[PDB]
Symmetry: C3
Amino acid sequence: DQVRRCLRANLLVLLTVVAVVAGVALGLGVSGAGGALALGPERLSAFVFPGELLLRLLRMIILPLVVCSLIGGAASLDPGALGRLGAWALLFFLVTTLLASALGVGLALALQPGAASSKEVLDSFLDLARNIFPSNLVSAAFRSYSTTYEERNITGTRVKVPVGQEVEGMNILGLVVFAIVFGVALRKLGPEGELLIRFFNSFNEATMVLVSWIMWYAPVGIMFLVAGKIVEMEDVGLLFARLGKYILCCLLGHAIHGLLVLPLIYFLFTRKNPYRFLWGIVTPLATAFGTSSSSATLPLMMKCVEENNGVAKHISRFILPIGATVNMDGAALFQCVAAVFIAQLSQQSLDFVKIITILVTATASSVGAAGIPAGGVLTLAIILEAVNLPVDHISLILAVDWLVDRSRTVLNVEGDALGAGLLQNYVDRT
Amino acid sequence: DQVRRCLRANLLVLLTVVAVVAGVALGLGVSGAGGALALGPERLSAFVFPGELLLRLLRMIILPLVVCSLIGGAASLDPGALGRLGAWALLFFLVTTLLASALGVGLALALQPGAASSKEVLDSFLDLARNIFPSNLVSAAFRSYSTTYEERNITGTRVKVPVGQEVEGMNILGLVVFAIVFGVALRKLGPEGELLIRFFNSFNEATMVLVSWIMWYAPVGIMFLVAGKIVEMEDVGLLFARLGKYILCCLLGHAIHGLLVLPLIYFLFTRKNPYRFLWGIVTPLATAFGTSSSSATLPLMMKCVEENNGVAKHISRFILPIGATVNMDGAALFQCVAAVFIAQLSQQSLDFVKIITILVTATASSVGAAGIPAGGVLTLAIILEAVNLPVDHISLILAVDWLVDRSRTVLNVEGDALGAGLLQNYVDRT
Amino acid sequence: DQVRRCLRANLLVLLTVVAVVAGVALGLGVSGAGGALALGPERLSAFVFPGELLLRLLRMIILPLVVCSLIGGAASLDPGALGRLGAWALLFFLVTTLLASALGVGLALALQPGAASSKEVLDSFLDLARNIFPSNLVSAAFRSYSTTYEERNITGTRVKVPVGQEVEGMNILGLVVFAIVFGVALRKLGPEGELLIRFFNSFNEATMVLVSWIMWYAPVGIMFLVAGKIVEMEDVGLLFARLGKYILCCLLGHAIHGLLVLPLIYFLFTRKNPYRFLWGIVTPLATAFGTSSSSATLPLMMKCVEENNGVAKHISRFILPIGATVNMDGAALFQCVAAVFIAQLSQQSLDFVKIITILVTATASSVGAAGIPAGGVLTLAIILEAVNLPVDHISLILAVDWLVDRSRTVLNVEGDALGAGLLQNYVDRT
């Protein structure tokens, strides 16, 4: 038949959807009883197991991935050899990614989906800053910093005085700064650093096969993961509603971002109608919402932005190819919204500095996740394990990533499309 | 004289035998008193010391050795470029190594030598499986996983519920799987992995000199080690008997393996007389029991297996050279028997999953220990420290490795000799 | 003006002196009140902070620096290809560095500056020796060994019996031996080690830019460091006196070393007047006390030692260039005196084995600190963190390193100058 073509080509996505349709079914069948058929937590602790094995594979693969990939991505950057006219594009990409992430965490905090049913002082900024630059780069790979208070009982009966120590679970946040500074150092070293860069970049592809094989294992892990998850909550008529509120929340966040904020930076700078520009460029968005692929939509988008509202004719070949892989605004929006939704689902007591380190770490990792096909879930697990949040809920987000991803794709092309529709004045207005 | 020739050539073995003949003597002289001449444990804790220093050198050298050597030994394997006719030879080598190790642990458990004078449930398989794929590859280098039980006191007064944490002492077992998957990944990456393979293989010879120098230090360490060991037991008329029972046990295990099990796989597949084949190939076994060297006996063995019972004339040049360094059945037999003998000598309470991880880890490390001349003791220390067993008793095994090694050599050539006498039917019977 | 020339060229030293002149001033202004304006320890724990951030950067940079630099400095050494006539120069350099360090710790212990206002037995040598060769090279990067005593209560009521465990804070001392043996192993491996040496040496320059940038950050860190330090002591009329006693102590140690000990090894071997030799070579010392630079003073010194007291005419081109970067006697003197002064200032209870590991570790690191311009403070922080001493007091030593460094420079040229004035007899007297 023709079934062999559509089987082997798109196999892993069919495997994970046929795994998750049973994972909801098996968890439904054992959730018909109240979490205990014959062994309540005992057989459950082994019934939940291969999803936990999948997370065990994911943590040991997200250590070397982030350190070697950010070394290879911070040695590659050459701001001197990229043009000041191109540098303002990077500035715009960074500020709109920060803006998208900020508004997304703001709206997800405002609606607070999922929540429907350690006293640390303001001086956690010192703990976060000490966690940025760690004590040594081996204890930084498995344990981060944390200050607990004791009582010296001086000047009265009690005094809340902080002692400082290192608690378990790594700091990716404190490691990405060292790897980025290492890549910048390898650039500034120059020709002696060629061997180290050819080492570390080759180390990255020596782990892309590893995450490829973990992706091959991923269906049975995600099936057992979501099965143990829905037998844990014991509320299907509410978890459906929590997931739907989260989905609607992040899609309307995508909508209000792409419909007001990029229009805000348009009209605040160009003072021309953004709606006429978008009405000019409807059809590559009509294929981005068709295919959901930022790679294949790029030639039609580059051809369209030159015809309607004629751009500077070279940045369409310069900033628009490179902007598709660096300004993924909707993906950063999705990751910052979804991680706050898990914390509001598990009641993890968000400090404001936890909001800052879920902002900036997921912001800098927006430029990644492009070589990895399912990098949106991988980077989400990265920023979950950077704040010691439960990665256990990632199956539910990966259960419904398609329905929101169809809308997430168009933000990532709308951003750099409007950036192409913005910097044409900087040779005119200057 | 002629003494300078036989001194410098074979020097280290003369050094360790003249060290161990004094180590039994000094421990005898201080064991004439009951473990306390003038300071019982106090001066003893410094009298025992340089053997513990030798073990301190051995652990810090067996970390990088196993990770870099298994990377260099899992990048080298090419099953696609080795032939399906050659692949069944690898299958046979693996199954006879597993069979030899299984029967050896079975018989050493059955006789239980040395023993003459933490309640963990069946769910340790999850602990072992989580210990296979670790959380991160830096905490995997010094500490493994272990689940302890506490009491939530829910549904009654007490409930044995497992919490999970990471206890000290590394998991080589959890590290060899990552290094092997890394080498396979470097193969599947191809030409970008050339720099990483030339890194990691060069790292191996950057530690073979290290174990050469630790071997140079080894005589005084093993002398003080066995001296502190025999003053610890305070029973020489029994420890002699325990060692003799162990020696007789492993040599008869070698005997029953090479006399029935390889005949079993012969007669079950060929249905021809194995004794006539062995009577044909007596004389290379007569030199293997002469010289005790698998390298030098290989040309005579390859010439002999073609004359008597004429083999397929090319696999003798293909599977018989490579089988001498990969199918070391008797060495794996020795390591799995000797490690169980130490645990039965120290009462280390063997779980069945400890039997599984002393089976399979020592099975996969049978292919090693060939470039290292005294690799039989090194791999034994590896599989002892992979299960947190006391490495302290390794002097007694290295005291008598010669007497059993004379018989251990002939198993390693008898195995692939009978494998050459087996796969000739697969072009005839097919 | 001409101010732009003297600004950009010597900028960092002007930055750190204008930072330290305010750091004494701000700490003076807040020390006018008794350590508490409105928040005693609470705002102080954040007021002290960026100096602690500077130390946080320094520890994570002194791990990879010492391991890669000593690999690159132990692979470079070739005693076979350096001449036995040149090897006695290395022997003399090592013994005069050990002698200078020994006399410096002796005199600094004898005067005991700064002190004006854990019972471990003699068996710490076993703890130090186990700390030399660690258990594994990942736990050796963040935690060292330490034996605590408990009571088995056997043979009486109590018995002080040592248990052994690993306590936090790395052992550089146990790591430098592994890196040095690794570099020697890479030499003895030869042409397969070329890739590893070109890796590790390139890794060194990939951290010299890192310590360059930490040096750029260093002024505000040292200002806040000394400001929090002088508000801690609350005694300026004594800390001035403690610092002056320390300065006078180390400068007179330099004086008595260069005026008696190198004359002692002169007259004990040559039996000629050392004062006539020094009166011959006054003027390169007059420029070394002028410029304070061992690099630029070397041609004038090499020309001067040949004219007055005519040396062997080739070792002046052989041992005198290489001796300027390996025999830094005064720097090792300074580091061993200053570290004992901190321990006598903080009452850190010096064991004799702590004197041994502050002797030998700082002795072997005298050959370093030459490529780093402010390597005298960096190596001081290294040998402070090798013995878990407080690095917190390093601002006061770096506050006054100039006043003693002016005298420290002449020892480093006086040593190898007198060594050139010594080995000329070994072709004459032989």
